Amino acid sequence: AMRIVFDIGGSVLVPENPDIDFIKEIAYQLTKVSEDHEVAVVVGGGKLARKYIEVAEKFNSSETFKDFIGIQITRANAMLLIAALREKAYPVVVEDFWEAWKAVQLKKIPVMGGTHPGHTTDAVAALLAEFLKADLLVVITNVDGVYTADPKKDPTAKKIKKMKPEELLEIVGKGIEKAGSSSVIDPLAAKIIARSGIKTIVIGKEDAKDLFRVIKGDHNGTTIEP
Amino acid sequence: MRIVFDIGGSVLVPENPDIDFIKEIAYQLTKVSEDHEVAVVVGGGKLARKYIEVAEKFNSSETFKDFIGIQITRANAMLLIAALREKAYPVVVEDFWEAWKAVQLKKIPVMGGTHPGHTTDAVAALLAEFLKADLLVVITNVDGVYTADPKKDPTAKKIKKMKPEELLEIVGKGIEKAGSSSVIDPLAAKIIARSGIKTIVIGKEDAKDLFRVIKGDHNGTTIEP
Amino acid sequence: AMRIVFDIGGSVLVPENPDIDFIKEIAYQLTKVSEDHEVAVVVGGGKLARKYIEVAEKFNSSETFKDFIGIQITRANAMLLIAALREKAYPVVVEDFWEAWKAVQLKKIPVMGGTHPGHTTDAVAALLAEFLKADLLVVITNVDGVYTADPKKDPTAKKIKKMKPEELLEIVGKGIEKAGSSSVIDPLAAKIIARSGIKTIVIGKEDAKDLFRVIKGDHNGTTIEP
Amino acid sequence: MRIVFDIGGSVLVPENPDIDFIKEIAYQLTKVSEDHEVAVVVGGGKLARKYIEVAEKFNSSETFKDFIGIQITRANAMLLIAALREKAYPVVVEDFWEAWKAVQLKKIPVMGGTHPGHTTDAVAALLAEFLKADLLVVITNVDGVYTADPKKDPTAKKIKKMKPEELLEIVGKGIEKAGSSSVIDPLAAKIIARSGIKTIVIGKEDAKDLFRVIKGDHNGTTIEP
Amino acid sequence: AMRIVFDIGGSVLVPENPDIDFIKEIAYQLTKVSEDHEVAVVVGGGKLARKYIEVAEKFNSSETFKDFIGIQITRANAMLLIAALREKAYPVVVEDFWEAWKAVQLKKIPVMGGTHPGHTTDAVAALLAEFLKADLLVVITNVDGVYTADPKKDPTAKKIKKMKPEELLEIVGKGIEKAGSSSVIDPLAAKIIARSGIKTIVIGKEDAKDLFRVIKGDHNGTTIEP
Amino acid sequence: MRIVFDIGGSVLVPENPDIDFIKEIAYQLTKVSEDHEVAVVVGGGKLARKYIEVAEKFNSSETFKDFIGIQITRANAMLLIAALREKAYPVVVEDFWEAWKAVQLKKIPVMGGTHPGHTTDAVAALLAEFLKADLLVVITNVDGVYTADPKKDPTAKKIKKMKPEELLEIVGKGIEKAGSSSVIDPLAAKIIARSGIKTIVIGKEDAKDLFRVIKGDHNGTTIEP
Numbered sequence A, C, E: 001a002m003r004i005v006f007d008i009g010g011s012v013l014v015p016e017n018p019d020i021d022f023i024k025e026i027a028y029q030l031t032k033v034s035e036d037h038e039v040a041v042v043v044g045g046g047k048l049a050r051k052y053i054e055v056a057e058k059f060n061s062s063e064t065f066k067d068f069i070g071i072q073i074t075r076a077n078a079m080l081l082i083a084a085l086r087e088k089a090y091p092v093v094v095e096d097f098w099e100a101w102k103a104v105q106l107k108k109i110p111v112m113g114g115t116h117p118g119h120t121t122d123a124v125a126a127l128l129a130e131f132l133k134a135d136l137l138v139v140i141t142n143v144d145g146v147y148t149a150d151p152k153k154d155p156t157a158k159k160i161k162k163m164k165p166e167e168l169l170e171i172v173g174k175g176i177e178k179a180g181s182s183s184v185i186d187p188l189a190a191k192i193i194a195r196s197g198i199k200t201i202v203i204g205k206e207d208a209k210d211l212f213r214v215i216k217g218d219h220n221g222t223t224i225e226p
Numbered sequence B, D, F: 001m002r003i004v005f006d007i008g009g010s011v012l013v014p015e016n017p018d019i020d021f022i023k024e025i026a027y028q029l030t031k032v033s034e035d036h037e038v039a040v041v042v043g044g045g046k047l048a049r050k051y052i053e054v055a056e057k058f059n060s061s062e063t064f065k066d067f068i069g070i071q072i073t074r075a076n077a078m079l080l081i082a083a084l085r086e087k088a089y090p091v092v093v094e095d096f097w098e099a100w101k102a103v104q105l106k107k108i109p110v111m112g113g114t115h116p117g118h119t120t121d122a123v124a125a126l127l128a129e130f131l132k133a134d135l136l137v138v139i140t141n142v143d144g145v146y147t148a149d150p151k152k153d154p155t156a157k158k159i160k161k162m163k164p165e166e167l168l169e170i171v172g173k174g175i176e177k178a179g180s181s182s183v184i185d186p187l188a189a190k191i192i193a194r195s196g197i198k199t200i201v202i203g204k205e206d207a208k209d210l211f212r213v214i215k216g217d218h219n220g221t222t223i224e225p
């Protein structure tokens, strides 16, 4: 009954290597969810992308060129999902929004990676959600939600349950994102979510193992909403 | 030296195209490219906002509104290309590597927008970053960066020199929406900050003599690490 | 029951600025007409295109380059229609005929602008009609029909009701069209219409406010037909 | 000087490719590019009409028939590219800006068709217009423009010099259909007229010495404002 | 009930010139076969391609460039089929597999020619069959089947009825294919057919005049199968 | 001289990228391009096989597995491009004519894969053939071509010199599947044979001094008609 965009982190799909079972599992659920909803997906780069970006840095590449290498990896990861989605997926990695649109019209799941430098795949997901006028944006990261601070660094981090887009920006928004930089949601994405008021859900791997219920409201993550 | 110029659409096209300015700026750019490598990106201006407003009355997404804006920036870019005559890359550049090619051919590439979510300011910063340019010159409607909006606030004072971090405080928090204005868009500010791109912000008057501006002789703002 | 191509003049959609209500109105009718017919559209450049072409002339650009600037504006205008067509339109501006074809297959209205230098959007519309083997080509200009001469210049201009393609060429056909030049139908278009015998209707803004009836034969314009 | 050559497919491929001519014309072009900037567009010829006739038996639209013709012109263009060896742009040029690039690289770009509705004659005129070429040389099956069809009418007389307006009277009225022939297609005639492109029409014999032709030494027709 | 890829030789469609009736006939049957099956096609270059490649050789072009000229001709031939297929065909010549896929989704017959140098249209057909996970690959050549040797050269040539992919490679597989070179199935194609076990049928023009039955198993050609 | 280098992904990326090697090979290439025209193609390596294996667990066709492999080869190509800094074409080359352009700009083009059905070895051979290169240098995990697999067979002997026909016997029969390895893939072997491309096969040690390798001073294999 609705349109949903999924932003799956590269480190979730590829922790250090591919998590075969998670991919097979996540691909199965997206397929099921697409049985009654319009589904579009964006995959991240993760550990592997940072390794290639670190190499380029050793050669002093510009931050723009590293972004491109990062983009190249995200597309590689995206192809692993497309593979696991079998015939329900759009064969090739989508590179622009209009094409994602066509895939949806053909009732096939479009899987895309990065687009242009200056941001992360989160921003791609947000803009996609916005372009398709999606009803839900599901961000699957390697943290169970959005906290008061970095849950892996701070001990007093509070896992916010609900919040406004303006509140999400306060958390991030002021971050100077370098090629390889990581966050729950990149500053640009936050601004896009706030900009047009995109209902957004942030969840971890554990909760991501039950998407069908997650998109029903039953999950233990954060819910950014106007 | 490698220099990237970010010319505001409102400066190039106030209401209708500003022939005289386009013309004078074309001569400056031509003069500068004689001893320097020049690349250029142009904005949307009044025309971009007008078409974006129409799309708004039809409830278009912000993403589609951005695309329309990008289309307008490319049309404006073509007017500058016309002005530069034989010193310009004949077509609107849409990728950074193509700009690189243009430069390899001793030609001036003129870009318009690229993708949604930001403005041409970001395109010019990314381009400067990409080409490892020595300098980014931003030509806009104000003569520099002020402590506040010079056209609104009476207490606004011009900041002659600052660091990316400071420029960031003056901006970076505004959520850029289709057609939104800013002395420098947030994203562009973060790009400049992340790479430490030497940036100069000047107005139309200073633009009349880019040869002096690139030497630090201007009344605008200089931003550098 | 049929396939129709609409050639809407840029000066009709954008007299000096956008005519919001006409666009909203025209977009609504095309949507309705597409409920039972296959619809494809081409939009012109109008006043705005001539302003940009005039600027380039001051810099002595070649007629080819001005054509390109003209093309750039037509695509901008086309996006305003796509905007007003909402979800019934193909998201991006179509640039070639094969793509217009796909849009039609997806049962979405393809809106295109110019293609290559040397002509006007009229020629694009005619070739489109021809490519899709359309049954009707509807040219909406800022004149109520094809006259014996320019209705805005000559006082003895006769508003022909019907005519043959060979007759339309006599009117135009011998025109040397420069970048920015305007006419009821450019010489090339005329030749295409005559070439394959495309049933063509030319109408003004007033009549264009009732397309549904116009495509039924009830209108006060001209009807070029084999 | 900047020169654009419009070589008829029927001259290049009469029935089968004309090896000797392709070969000799390649040498002339190579010789000319030594001191001039050279760009080239090739037509479809006998082969184009043959494939177009087949599509006709299947009731294809004139537009699709044009596309097929364009495909043939590009194949022919590749034979000339082969002939020019290292002096040519390695691939068939399809845009005018790419032709421009080729020229910037001191390479000879060879184009085939572009879009439906006209022929390669128009492509060469638009290209000449685009590059602001000094001269457009049309090599065809006749040795010049005559008052009438030289291969049909006994009274046809060769016109040594004329203006675009006159060339226009001799053509411009014919409704160009897929594969239609003409000493110069109407659209091309209007392009030449609108920009005042100095044009020279010559046959195969004169083609053997392009170095003399570009100096005005030929038995063909010269068209200029 | 199945997906079929047809590899039609250029010399079969264009012996020396186009065989109008064979094309009209072959186009009609493919249309009928597509009524109940998913059909995709690849056309060859034939005599004409070799003529252009021979010309380039006289100018000493590299084998790669000749491959490109060969490719250009195959696309020309492909357009003749598209023409004969009328509205049941995808309008433009397909150049990559993903696009062939879309055409099939739109339930239109995708007709493609060559892709990249180094091989023949046979290899394109095999890889296509493989990409679409086709159930049958039908190779229509100008010989009634795969023989022990060249039926036009050797007098003791045995027309094998059935065989394994590994057996087909023994026949070919070791061939050094130059631009313009011809064979029942190019070495690369053979390897692709063997690689993923593609059920393949090789037939001549005569048998090709009854595709519907051919795809049923009733034909007098060869049947390469795992 | 015109030289094409075919650097194995496993040499460039054994497990993780081999910084030191990438770095050293970048210097060699830079040194060589000083007096020669250089073009490069990089393979997939360990990473390509890893992603291809994952796709295999999902029953992907061999064609899709090839595409994934091509994507990995392009990522690796970008690491080399980074290493070559200003001497390289800024983006991954995907067509042979673009490689040609890069060379026209005195820049080093680095390609990854192109189409399915073969490996990067074939891409480099076709590229060498295309550019009419004087030499094809294949850098891999072994130090030359042996009578048998040097890492398996104890009797394997290194062949110092041979003809395409002989190289063909040692390979050419293996049915290349997604991610399959070979000192030289069959298709590449047939390309080398059909045009008679002078080819040199060397290992990582010799790669450290490409200036000597291109002169015939190496411990690898030389293949030529």
Ligand SMILES: Nc1ncnc2c1ncn2[C@@H]1O[C@H](COP(=O)(O)OP(=O)(O)NP(=O)(O)O)[C@@H](O)[C@H]1O
Pocket: A008, A009, A010, A011, A012, A043, A044, A045, A046, A047, A121, A140, A141, A142, A143, A145, A146, A147, A148, A149, A150, A151, A152, A171, A181, A182, A183, A184, A185
């Ligand atoms: N307030 C916060 N709440 C939750 N996570 C936070 C917060 N602040 C910082 N983080 C960090 O965000 C990380 C999350 O996202 P990130 O590493 O960027 O992965 P990803 O986006 O899922 N993957 P990919 O697309 O491949 O980069 C955590 O593991 C934290 O280190």
Ligand SMILES: Nc1ncnc2c1ncn2[C@@H]1O[C@H](COP(=O)(O)OP(=O)(O)NP(=O)(O)O)[C@@H](O)[C@H]1O
Pocket: B007, B008, B009, B010, B011, B042, B043, B044, B045, B046, B120, B139, B140, B141, B142, B144, B145, B146, B147, B148, B149, B150, B151, B170, B180, B181, B182, B183, B184
């Ligand atoms: N602190 C400040 N310093 C200078 N200008 C400011 C400041 N704060 C706000 N502004 C505004 O910034 C405007 C500047 O830029 P902007 O309108 O976005 O034009 P542009 O970027 O030159 N054009 P274009 O590319 O077509 O949008 C001024 O005219 C002010 O209204």
Ligand SMILES: Nc1ncnc2c1ncn2[C@@H]1O[C@H](COP(=O)(O)OP(=O)(O)NP(=O)(O)O)[C@@H](O)[C@H]1O
Pocket: C008, C009, C010, C011, C012, C043, C044, C045, C046, C047, C121, C140, C141, C142, C143, C145, C146, C147, C148, C149, C150, C151, C152, C171, C181, C182, C183, C184, C185
């Ligand atoms: N015989 C005629 N009948 C009707 N109009 C004529 C005739 N002869 C000349 N004209 C002119 O044609 C004009 C019409 O078309 P034109 O100005 O080119 O607008 P358009 O094609 O609708 N717009 P666009 O696509 O943006 O250029 C009129 O307003 C007349 O000045």
Ligand SMILES: Nc1ncnc2c1ncn2[C@@H]1O[C@H](COP(=O)(O)OP(=O)(O)NP(=O)(O)O)[C@@H](O)[C@H]1O
Pocket: D007, D008, D009, D010, D011, D042, D043, D044, D045, D046, D120, D139, D140, D141, D142, D144, D145, D146, D147, D148, D149, D150, D151, D170, D180, D181, D182, D183, D184
């Ligand atoms: N007045 C004329 N002067 C010269 N030729 C004429 C004239 N009128 C008609 N023609 C015809 O023009 C033909 C010329 O051009 P055409 O057959 O179209 O060849 P092409 O343009 O050289 N080839 P291609 O690009 O492959 O079509 C002659 O052979 C005549 O039959």
Ligand SMILES: Nc1ncnc2c1ncn2[C@@H]1O[C@H](COP(=O)(O)OP(=O)(O)NP(=O)(O)O)[C@@H](O)[C@H]1O
Pocket: E008, E009, E010, E011, E012, E043, E044, E045, E046, E047, E121, E140, E141, E142, E143, E145, E146, E147, E148, E149, E150, E151, E152, E171, E181, E182, E183, E184, E185
């Ligand atoms: N063992 C064999 N069995 C059958 N044909 C064979 C065999 N060995 C060699 N051939 C040759 O294969 C030829 C067949 O294919 P070929 O000439 O390449 O045409 P094609 O592939 O149908 N056309 P195209 O795609 O345009 O090249 C025959 O006419 C024989 O000369």
Ligand SMILES: Nc1ncnc2c1ncn2[C@@H]1O[C@H](COP(=O)(O)OP(=O)(O)NP(=O)(O)O)[C@@H](O)[C@H]1O
Pocket: F007, F008, F009, F010, F011, F042, F043, F044, F045, F046, F120, F139, F140, F141, F142, F144, F145, F146, F147, F148, F149, F150, F151, F170, F180, F181, F182, F183, F184
């Ligand atoms: N006769 C032979 N001579 C040399 N190597 C051989 C021979 N036969 C088999 N091999 C194998 O060839 C391997 C060589 O190449 P390969 O593993 O495919 O790496 P690569 O091509 O350098 N890398 P990439 O482009 O990423 O695949 C060796 O390590 C051997 O296991």
Ligand SMILES: O=c1ccn([C@@H]2O[C@H](COP(=O)(O)O)[C@@H](O)[C@H]2O)c(=O)[nH]1
Pocket: A010, A043, A044, A045, A046, A049, A066, A067, A068, A069, A070, A071, A074, A113, A114, A115, A116, A117, A118, A119, A120, A121, A122, A124, A178, A179, A180, A181, A182
């Ligand atoms: O649209 C995109 C997607 C990715 N990246 C580059 O790829 C990295 C990996 O992406 P992700 O995993 O962080 O989303 C980013 O940090 C970044 O430098 C971009 O520049 N733009």
Ligand SMILES: O=c1ccn([C@@H]2O[C@H](COP(=O)(O)O)[C@@H](O)[C@H]2O)c(=O)[nH]1
Pocket: B009, B042, B043, B044, B045, B048, B065, B066, B067, B068, B069, B070, B073, B112, B113, B114, B115, B116, B117, B118, B119, B120, B121, B123, B177, B178, B179, B180
């Ligand atoms: O890379 C770009 C350039 C422009 N725009 C759209 O064009 C407008 C006009 O650009 P500018 O004048 O603001 O730079 C922007 O505000 C915006 O919506 C983009 O989305 N992305």
Ligand SMILES: O=c1ccn([C@@H]2O[C@H](COP(=O)(O)O)[C@@H](O)[C@H]2O)c(=O)[nH]1
Pocket: C010, C043, C044, C045, C046, C049, C066, C067, C068, C069, C070, C071, C074, C113, C114, C115, C116, C117, C118, C119, C120, C121, C122, C124, C178, C179, C180, C181, C182
């Ligand atoms: O396919 C096209 C469409 C438009 N134009 C240029 O755009 C102008 C505006 O188009 P229109 O409004 O006249 O159709 C034309 O006069 C002309 O120079 C072209 O060259 N080719």
Ligand SMILES: O=c1ccn([C@@H]2O[C@H](COP(=O)(O)O)[C@@H](O)[C@H]2O)c(=O)[nH]1
Pocket: D009, D042, D043, D044, D045, D048, D065, D066, D067, D068, D069, D070, D073, D112, D113, D114, D115, D116, D117, D118, D119, D120, D121, D123, D177, D178, D179, D180
């Ligand atoms: O820019 C072009 C070039 C060629 N053709 C098609 O190719 C034919 C062969 O071209 P030529 O030999 O007539 O120039 C034309 O008659 C025609 O149908 C076009 O449509 N447009």
Ligand SMILES: O=c1ccn([C@@H]2O[C@H](COP(=O)(O)O)[C@@H](O)[C@H]2O)c(=O)[nH]1
Pocket: E010, E043, E044, E045, E046, E049, E066, E067, E068, E069, E070, E071, E074, E113, E114, E115, E116, E117, E118, E119, E120, E121, E122, E124, E178, E179, E180, E181, E182
């Ligand atoms: O994907 C392709 C298709 C065709 N060709 C060139 O076209 C010729 C004609 O193709 P075909 O008729 O042999 O299939 C081939 O022999 C060859 O040199 C290629 O290089 N690659």
Ligand SMILES: O=c1ccn([C@@H]2O[C@H](COP(=O)(O)O)[C@@H](O)[C@H]2O)c(=O)[nH]1
Pocket: F009, F042, F043, F044, F045, F048, F065, F066, F067, F068, F069, F070, F073, F112, F113, F114, F115, F116, F117, F118, F119, F120, F121, F123, F177, F178, F179, F180
């Ligand atoms: O032109 C190419 C290059 C690479 N690959 C895929 O990438 C793999 C990795 O390439 P390489 O390391 O084997 O050269 C190949 O085995 C294969 O499946 C291709 O299909 N075609």
Ligand SMILES: [Mg+2]
Pocket: A007, A008, A009, A010, A043, A044, A120, A121, A122
């Ligand atoms: Mg992410």
Ligand SMILES: [Mg+2]
Pocket: A009, A122, A141, A183, A184, A185, A186
């Ligand atoms: Mg994230």
Ligand SMILES: [Mg+2]
Pocket: B006, B007, B008, B009, B041, B042, B043, B120, B121
């Ligand atoms: Mg700007």
Ligand SMILES: [Mg+2]
Pocket: B119, B121, B181, B182, B183, B184, B185
């Ligand atoms: Mg700004």
